[PDB]
Structure formats: C-alpha cells, structure tokens
Assembly symmetry: C3
Homo-oligomer: 247 residues x 3
C-alpha cells in the first residue's frame, strides 16, 4: 500500500518520456526509502538505472515494499495531460491498479491495470572508464544532432584538454569540439591520453530529449566500452543510462 | 439585399470552426432582428441552435429578410485568413453570391456562391433537465480529453456538492471532479439530488475546441436525456448544442 | 582557398531555405568582390539572381577565385541546426569539400562534398515593365494565400492609385487591394498608367515563406511579363527572382 505525492507531474512526465522510448513496460521497485528501476532494452543496447529517494516527494508514504509494473505508454499518455503546476499523486491500495491523480484547478484520477512484476535481477559490471566529463545538455544535444545528419554512429573522444564528438559517413564528416574554454564543458578528467568509442546516435538523442539545455549531464567512457550518461534529479535523484558501444 | 459588419472576424471564425466540424453547409436565416440557424447533423446526434441578434453588429442593415446557404469549409477557410484586428463584412446584392470582406491593414473581398438554401423547420422539445451548471470551458475540455484516453463516451454526474466527468473503458477508468471552490465551477443547480447521463466524447471535443479556456459554458443534463451545452455571445448572442444521450 | 565569415547563420538559413524550394543544387561563384549565382530552375518558370558583395561578411579572405557547387538540402539541413547564438563560417581548401562552421557556445564543423560546377552562362533579359512597387512581404502573403483559395493563378494589377491582387475560377473570386494609405505599400513607381500579368500562386508562396511580414519586397511587373520579385540583404546584397507569367 502506498501514497506518494510529487509536486510536478510535468517534470515526472519527462522522465517517463525518456523511458518509454526504450521499454514497453517498466518495473518500479517501490521501497521505504524511495523508488528504483533497472531495466534493459530488448536489443541489449540500453540499460537504465533509476533512483528516486523519498526526500524528492512532497508526501511519501509506503507500507509494504513492493514492485509494481505497468505499461509505459499508457502511463505516459496520462502524464501528458498534466498542466503547468499540476501535482502528481501515485497511489496503490488493495486491488491491482495504480491510481494516478493530477491535481490542479480540477482533480483528475486515473486507474491503470498493473501487470506481472517478474523482473529478473540485473547485475552491473564494474567498468574501466578512462574519461569523465560534465557537459551541458544543450551541448550534447548539439553534438548528437549534428552527428545524425552525417551518420547513425557518433564518436566520443577525449584527450585531457579536449572533448570531441565526431561522425563520419560515405561523403561527409562532423567534428564538434569542447575545451575548458566553452560554457558547455564544466569539467574534464582523463585517466590517460587516448580514448575512443562509437555509440548509436538514435539511442543518445532519445536519452537527451527530455532534459533542458541547462541541465548538467555526467559522461564516462573508454575504448569499445559502454557509455554512461547520468543525470542528477533535483540534487538527490539519479538517472543513469549505459549504452553499448559499436563496430 | 443586406450589408452586415462585425467587429472581429477572428471571433466570427471560432463559431464557424465549430459549425464546420458538424456540417458541410449552413443555412443562415437573416432577419431584421438578427441571424438564426438551427439544424441537425447528418449523423443525427447533435442539434445546433444559433441566435445572433442585430445588437452584436457594428452595422446591421437588411433591405429584405433572406435565407442564404453556403459551403462551411469554404467560408471557414476564408475566415482563417483574418488578421488580429480585421473587421468582417457580409453583403448580398442582387445575385447568387455572398460578398465577404476582411477589412484591415489589407482589404480583402471574396465572392463565394450560394447553394440551394434548403433546411426544414425544427422544434426544440422542452425536456426535463434535473441538473444545471455554469463551468469554464477549460475544465470541460480537460475532462473530455482525459475521458478520451479510456473510452468513447463520458458520464456527466452531479451531487449537490460536485460535478464529476467519468469514463470506464477496457480495464481502466478516469474521474474528473469539480467542487464549488474551484475556479472551473461557477454555479451548480439541481432539482433532483443525483444526476447521471452518458455522451459522445468525439462530439464534445468538437464543440469545445474553439472556446477559450475562460469562457463560461452552461450545461443542463439529467437522467438519460440529451445534454445542452450553451454559450452566450458577447452576452447577447447564443450558441447551443443538444447532444443525444447514449 | 577562401574563408568567408557571415554574422548570422540564421539569416543565411532563410535565404538558403528559399533557393532550396527551387533548385536541388546551386553553383556559387566566389569572387574577390562577392558571391553570385544566376540560374533558371529545372521546371523553367523561375530565374534566380543573387549577389552578395564582400561587405556583407565580417571576414572575406579569398586567396583565389572559383565556382563551387553543392546540394542545397544538405546545406540547408545544416544551417537549420543554427541557433540564435551562432556565427557562420564557410571555408574552402585544396581538398574538394565545403567546410561549414557553426560557431556559438560550441563549435561545429561540417564537411560537405562539392559537386560538379556545370552551369550555363545566363543573360538577364530587358523588360518593358510599367510599375515597380515597394511593399511589405506580409501584405503579399495575404494576397497570395487569399488567391490560393480560389485558383492556381493570381493577377497582379496596378493603377497610379492602387495595387490589386485578384484571382478567379471555381465559381468564386477574390481581390486584395493595397492603397498608399495602407502600411503595406511604401512606394509606387509608374512608367505607365497600369499593369497586369498573371502568375503561379504556388511559385509566389515558395518565395515569400522565409520572408518576415515586415520585410520590404521590391516587385516590378507590366502587361503579360515576368515579375521581378526582389529583396535586399542588409541593404547591400540583393536576391531577385523572375517569374514567367501566364
């Protein structure tokens, strides 16, 4: 049994929008100290690790901890009805429905059918990342969107002064390059000197679309090793994607 | 023969854009007293009644009382070009054409043909409404829009305390609740204490889309009777829909 | 070897967007004095003339002169990535590719492949035009949109007093009138009393689209002749279009 209240349904819409891009269904582990989800796409290209601690929520109250599961696209449509300043209520009682409320000038209350919550354990390898950077979302979205014109793949490369995103096609190429001189780069740490991998443009663009240009995004990578893109949610939540490399 | 002038071609557009979701052609009855329309849609769920008194027009000048009939979608496209402050002119002179003027920074005049002006006399049957309400459009549009997710029809329900719009459909339901403290509900009148009737989501959508969020809408419904959605035009006009229950 | 640096990618985008509606490719003579392009469209009814003198650019280093050709949609799509905060760089080297620089918060550098510069020399004909006029794009946009609703053809007309944009056929007509009292008409020049030619509604639409309502357009027509449609670029360079009549 739970009742959780978040003060921005629209913020939450935007997390759900990123998830629906990769998964048809999500399992939410609802615990005393917060919400967690971990899932992988059927292509095994994309892994999400999501942690939403209770402190993020206006009211948070859970009795028995349990996993709920529901159709991402169904939930997303409800959330797309939220107006500015609507609050969000997620509520579960006795039956097997998630109750969803949108509270504004009117109060709108949906009930959505829950489904089989059988997530098998997902284990996260340790990963020898040699690069780590903090960049602005608008900068990445630039890079990524410039790659798409040229290719389905984007190269992430670093030296210790240099963060470069490049693509190459049959007859075109595109380098976007960031140093400590640019606003979009906040931080750049190399544990070495040569670092290069490729990831699927389509995948990254779907990850970065909800974020506002000004959101900080954390990046970690290496040679032919999964890419990390992590966003802090109100300085407490985490949202983490691992994206498998290419070639 | 007439010449009629309205202050806001854009305002006029909103009305036409509604009529147009339900009809291909409109028959406007032009009288000394004003303009009138009343018809039922081909599908036969919706009745519209439209009174625009002389009062609303900056110039109203009828030389004789005419029925005139035109393609809605051709008229509407005309009005969609109206700019921010444009005046609208309607004029028939001695021929089968409606002179349409959009008067502003640019002056634009259309001649569009009249079609065969034939629509029957119709009686609006007084019917036993148990619930009345004045709500803001925005509120009803959200309600319908949230109902549409779950189902094809939406229930209008009232207690003396509240108006609720519900929908049950497949393995899902939704409820939208309004109380008197909310800005969306200005007035609730009841004769009976309970009220329940179902309607077409798709129709309601179409009636409501031209409305501003802040427009007052009067609703009258009851135990299994057509719904009356009404709104007033600059206070003196009236646009009314009767939607059949399901 | 040339490095040209333009102030506003976004303005440059607007121009490109237009050309693209008409050519899939374009040749650009990069000269010591400016960039020029003359070219008739595959479908034969439109001629573009473009000339952008060195002074428009914030930098105009150009070691030696050459023509360069390229796909427009590819260029265009790049320029559409340009944000508010972006400055445009067009660089050429020994290699056979156009380098394209979006300089703003971050810097993006593209390499687009230069294609075959096979472009006929074209002589701009002498024209017995009778009326030139300066008008606001917005006004003409009205004109043209109003015309589309009635025909694939719009008549451009002039008296010493007014500009009329008229069209007909279906069973309807439409005129848009622009007098000197109207803000949309700045300037009216006459070698003769009147003018009248008819042009492709579609071709106009495509031209006017990247234009803002407040942009000044020079138009110049006569009796059954092409129309010159020409605007300025930072009041220095020009882009002009000739449109065969009907």
């Amino acid at each position: 049994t739970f009742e959780i209240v978040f003060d921005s349904a629209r913020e939450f819409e935007s997390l759900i929008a990123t998830l629906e891009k990769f998964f048809d269904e999500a399992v939410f582990q609802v615990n005393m100290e917060g919400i967690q989800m971990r899932a992988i796409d059927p292509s095994r290209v994309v892994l999400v690790d999501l942690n939403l601690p209770e402190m993020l929520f206006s009211k948070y109250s859970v009795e028995s901890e349990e996993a709920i599961a529901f159709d991402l696209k169904r939930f997303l449509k409800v959330l797309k009805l939220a107006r500015s300043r609507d609050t969000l209520v997620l509520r579960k009682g006795g039956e097997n429905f998630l109750e969803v409320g949108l509270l504004g000038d009117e109060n709108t209350w949906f009930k959505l059918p829950l489904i089989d919550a059988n997530t098998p354990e997902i284990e996260i390898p340790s990963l020898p990342w040699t690069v780590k950077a903090v960049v602005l979302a608008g900068a990445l979205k630039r890079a990524v969107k410039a790659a798409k014109l040229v290719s389905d793949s984007i190269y992430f490369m670093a030296t210790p002064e240099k963060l470069t995103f490049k693509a190459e096609g049959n007859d075109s190429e595109v380098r976007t390059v960031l140093t400590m001189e640019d606003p979009g780069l906040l931080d750049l740490e190399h544990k070495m000197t040569k670092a290069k991998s490729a990831y699927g443009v389509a995948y990254l663009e779907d990850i970065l679309r909800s974020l506002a240009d000004a959101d900080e995004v954390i990046i970690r990578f290496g040679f032919d090793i999964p890419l990390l893109l992590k966003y802090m949610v109100r300085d407490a939540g985490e949202v983490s994607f691992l994206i498998a490399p290419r070639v």
